[PDB]
């Protein structure tokens, strides 16, 4: 099923852009997974921080970035491209606020980020960015919001999404979760993200093996739960 492929601008005979297709298969080359769960008034993103060395400066091995004071993003996929996508976003929001007088809603920031990725799929100049972004933000008039922008430029509004090597089970796990409708309390949402990531991998999730981000309607600011809190949260999940 290789197709004409070797060029992103040449359609396969069936109408499938193979080069764009291969983008997603590059997405899981990062070997990690991030899950975002939207609660009643919060959205929690949990990622895998597998630091394969005692020499690595653990402070800078983070997959979580702060796009803006109210919107936080996690990258799943190639670290280099994910970094560029993060950096391109920050300008896109800052241009949004500077241009219209207010902070860019998390809705568009994936749209503009998606729109940038889409033109790289038509004009055979830039090789596509091989990383999916998840934007979480407390949006006024629409509660907490989560979005996942893919290499081909498709973004959607997700009650919960996960991108990474174990996406099929992560989404199946969440799909099992969201349906038995429950009061998604901030504690419930943070717990839900941890369980989702834990069940798929089958890991204990030592305190430092993940990086959970949290955004709540009460304090609409992007925060990364400090290692003490995840342990407290993790112990809460156990009991």
């Amino acid at each position: 099923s290789a197709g004409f492929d070797r060029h992103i601008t040449i359609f396969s005979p069936e109408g499938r852009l193979y080069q764009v297709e291969y983008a997603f298969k590059a997405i899981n080359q990062g070997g990690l997974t991030s899950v975002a769960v939207r609660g009643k008034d919060c959205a929690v993103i949990v990622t895998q921080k597998k630091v394969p060395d005692k020499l690595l400066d653990s402070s800078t091995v983070t997959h979580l970035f702060k796009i803006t004071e109210n919107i936080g993003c996690v990258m799943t996929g190639m670290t280099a491209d994910s970094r560029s996508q993060v950096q391109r976003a920050r300008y896109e929001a800052a241009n949004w606020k500077y241009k219209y007088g207010y902070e860019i809603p998390v809705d568009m920031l994936c749209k503009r980020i998606a729109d940038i990725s889409q033109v790289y799929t038509q004009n055979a100049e830039m090789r596509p960015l091989g990383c999916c972004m998840i934007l979480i933000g407390i949006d006024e008039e629409q509660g907490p919001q989560v979005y996942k922008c893919d290499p081909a430029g498709y973004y959607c509004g997700f009650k919960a999404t996960a991108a990474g090597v174990k996406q099929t089970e992560s989404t199946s796990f969440l799909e099992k979760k969201v349906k038995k409708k429950f009061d998604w309390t901030f504690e419930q949402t943070v717990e839900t993200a941890i369980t989702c990531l834990s069940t798929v991998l089958s890991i204990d999730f030592k305190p430092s093996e993940i990086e959970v981000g949290v955004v709540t309607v009460e304090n609409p600011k992007f925060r990364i739960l400090t290692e003490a809190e995840i342990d407290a949260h993790l112990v809460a999940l156990a009991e």
Binding site: R6, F24, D57, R83
Partner: protein, 240 residues
């Protein structure tokens, strides 16, 4: 094959082969190591004098990106010098744009983005030199960053770039770099490097060091000649 000729083409398994090849050409360079002391970072690079006719200290791999930052390119040199010049133009534009020394992290991020900027277009090839940045600042501690060809840049307490990467961490992993002041680290970085570089292969060699920290007062300048002499003696005594 088929997907390995252009940097902008994704293999059906989903990876840019060109980047992989360049990162696997850095494996064919001289070993370069970096250890960050409690108040600084130390860089010690093995330089293989390819023939008795290049004057001492030629085609050096220890560069000064800016006043306080350090580079220790490991890989194809000619690509390194290019990466050095871009870094300085990035720093120089910084200091003139923001009035203060560009923080190591931001210099690595901008320099990392430039490196990743060349692994996206078919008209260019990815850089073949992966380099370690080192600096020390009373307001920012000591920071060490390794920018591999692919664009990833995250800091290392102690890292090695070149043929002996795995061999270089192993003997670096057995040191408590968190504490010893790189007064005593230089004797350790030099001692490490001699453990690597099996003599039977690669024949003769030379060793260049540099440090950033309080000891330098915030600069990166090469370790004073006097200090190196004992350091090399200190490493030499460890033959057994």
């Amino acid at each position: 094959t088929g997907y390995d000729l252009s940097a902008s083409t994704f293999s059906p398994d989903g990876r840019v082969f060109q980047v992989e090849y360049a990162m696997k050409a850095v494996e064919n360079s001289s070993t370069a190591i970096g250890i960050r002391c409690k108040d600084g970072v130390v860089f010690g690079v093995e330089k293989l004098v390819l023939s008795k006719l290049y004057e001492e200290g030629s085609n050096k791999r220890l560069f000064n990106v800016d006043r306080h930052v350090g580079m220790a390119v490991a890989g194809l040199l000619a690509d390194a010098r290019s990466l050095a010049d871009i870094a300085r133009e990035e720093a120089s534009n910084f200091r003139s744009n923001f009035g203060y020394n560009i923080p190591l992290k931001h210099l690595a991020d901008r320099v990392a983005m430039y490196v990743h900027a060349y692994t996206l277009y078919s008209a260019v090839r990815p850089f073949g030199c992966s380099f370690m940045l080192g600096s020390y600042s009373v307001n920012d501690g000591a920071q060490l960053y390794m920018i591999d060809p692919s664009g990833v840049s995250y800091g290392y307490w102690g890292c090695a770039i070149g043929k002996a990467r795995q061999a270089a961490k192993t003997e670096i992993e057995k040191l408590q770099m968190k504490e010893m002041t790189c007064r005593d680290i230089v004797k350790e970085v030099a001692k490490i490097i001699y453990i690597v570089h099996d003599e039977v292969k690669d024949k003769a060699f030379e060793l260049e060091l540099s440090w950033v920290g309080e000891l330098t007062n915030g600069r990166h300048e090469i370790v004073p000649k006097d200090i190196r002499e004992e350091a090399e003696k200190y490493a030499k005594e460890s033959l057994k």
